[PDB]
Structure 1
Amino acid sequence: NSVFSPDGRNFQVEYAVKAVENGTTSIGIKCNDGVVFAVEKLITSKLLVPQKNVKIQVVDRHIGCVYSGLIPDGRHLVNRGREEAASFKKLYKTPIPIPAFADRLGQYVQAHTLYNSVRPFGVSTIFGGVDKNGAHLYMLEPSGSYWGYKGAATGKGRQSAKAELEKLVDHHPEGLSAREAVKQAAKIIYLAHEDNKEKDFELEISWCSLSETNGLHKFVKGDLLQEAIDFAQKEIN
């Protein structure tokens, strides 16, 4: 963990990434006024209750988080994010800006790569929301590295998702609506499922849009969820 290799690398962090790669694929898409998050839920058995193993987590009221890798580690990171967001709001009154929040997670994750007594986190987290000056999407690696994104993907299906995400940035250089990106998120998740086809899956979408959700994090459900599923099923063939 606190061990540099002779060529300056951190093998433990690199191994933690392998745990991420191993996980379900999750994505985030930035639109002209909000953000969309989507995740693939592997249906191990018919015994799992549909819609009832929620993977996407809210932090404060305006931030959504999705992650791929060791799920428990993601929860540990979100708990911390929530403490860090409550603390910020307590002192400064305003809810935490997204870059501010990103760094809070960033420093916390990095800290877990400094000491021999701890392991790095076994997740990559895609997160963001709407603040005082626009929409923000982030992705945070086990090393504590994070940058802003137009689109982001992690997990097993990350390569095909990135390919689809790269295509969207090229066809829509002037924006892309929240209502559109929700559809597109359903599509990209479906395409990325190609790799994990041996088992069935369930799609979870959530969004935080200035005009569509009033800058608050909301789960996509009902008619909007079904319509996106349709689009994905119809465009897969």
Structure 2
Amino acid sequence: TGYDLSNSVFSPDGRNFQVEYAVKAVENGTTSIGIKCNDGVVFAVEKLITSKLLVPQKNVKIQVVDRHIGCVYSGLIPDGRHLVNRGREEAASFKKLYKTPIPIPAFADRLGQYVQAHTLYNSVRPFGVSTIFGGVDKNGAHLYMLEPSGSYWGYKGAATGKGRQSAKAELEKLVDHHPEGLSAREAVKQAAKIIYLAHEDNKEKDFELEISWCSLSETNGLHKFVKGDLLQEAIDFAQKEIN
């Protein structure tokens, strides 16, 4: 034993226990989800209201990269911010050299290689976040989810955090009941519902809902936060479904 004391050490199984321990920090975090729709993507996150003293709608969790990519994550929030800062540098250098905005699959690998690099040495710690991200590019809509190991895949729907099992089950129903697809406005409503349903795992404290979206028709392929009437409409739809 002692294989789990240092990062980048293979156990006799062929496992990197330090990365597996980073996953435990992710599982401890709040619930965040992603939904791929007809011409875009929708992101949503659970924000735990620890106290009344928290200013509503101020502690924003979802982050934009470039102008067409949205990023959300569960786990150690600072680690997520660090990853998004790098993502922004990667996106800027891509656009600097190649002119066009970074494609989502290209962007996904840039994050993937960076996270994977933090599993190669004992002088660094793996990332304590799973990141859900995506947007619209020339080839259409893309949704990705990235783990502490650097592993990522494309998704129809994605979920991570403490209420991921509940969320995943809900996402699987949408995939089955909508093979032709889901609209952007529908996806926002469904996203609200799923976060509310996933809140049963964090039912002690009440929470604040935060949603964002990129859609070719609804937002011109740019990342925007869901605000005001459209947000309230989604909250009402979500509250109606739990009762």
Tell whether the structures are fold-level matches, with TM greater than 0.5.
yes
> 1:2 and 1:169 mapped to 2: Cα distance?
37
Partner deviation per Cα, 1:76-129 (whole Å, 9 max, x = no partner): 000000000000000000000000000000000000000010110000000000
Counterpart CA distance in 2 for 1:74 and 1:2 is 21
1:8 to partner: Cα distance = 0.1
CA displacement, residues 55-80 of structure 1 (integer Å, 9 cap, x when unaligned): 00000000000000000000000000
- Secondary structure, counterpart of 1:29 in structure 2: strand
In structure 1, what is the Cα distance between the partners aligned to 2:74 and 2:86? 17
Partner of 1:44, secondary structure, is coil
TM-score by length of 1: 1.00
Corresponding residue of 1:157:
163
CA RMSD of aligned residues (A): 0.3
Residue aligned with 1:202, SS: strand
The alignment partner of 2:38 has SS state of coil
Query: Is the partner of 2:197 in helix, strand or coil?
Result: helix
Quote the Cα distance in structure 2 between the aligned partners of 1:2 and 1:27.
Answer: 29
- Distance in 2 (alpha carbons) for counterparts of 1:158 and 1:192: 7
TM-score where L is the length of structure 2: 0.97
1:137 aligned to 143, 152, 170, which one? 143
- SS for the counterpart of 2:115 is helix
Quote the offset at 1:2 in angstroms. Answer: 1.2
Deviation of the 1:135 alpha carbon? 0.2
SS at match of 1:142: coil
Structure 1 counterpart SS, 2:196: helix
Q: 3-state DSSP class of the match of 2:101?
A: coil
**% identity of equivalent residues:** 100
Secondary structure of 2:166 counterpart: helix
Q: Matched residues in 2 for 1:83 and 1:220: separation?
A: 26
Per-residue displacement from partner, 1:103-160 (whole Å, max 9, x unpaired)? 0000000000000101100000000000001100000000000000000000000000
- What are the superposed Cα offsets for residues 163-186 of structure 1, whole Å, 9 maximum, x if unpaired? 000000000001100000000000
- How many residue pairs match? The answer is 237
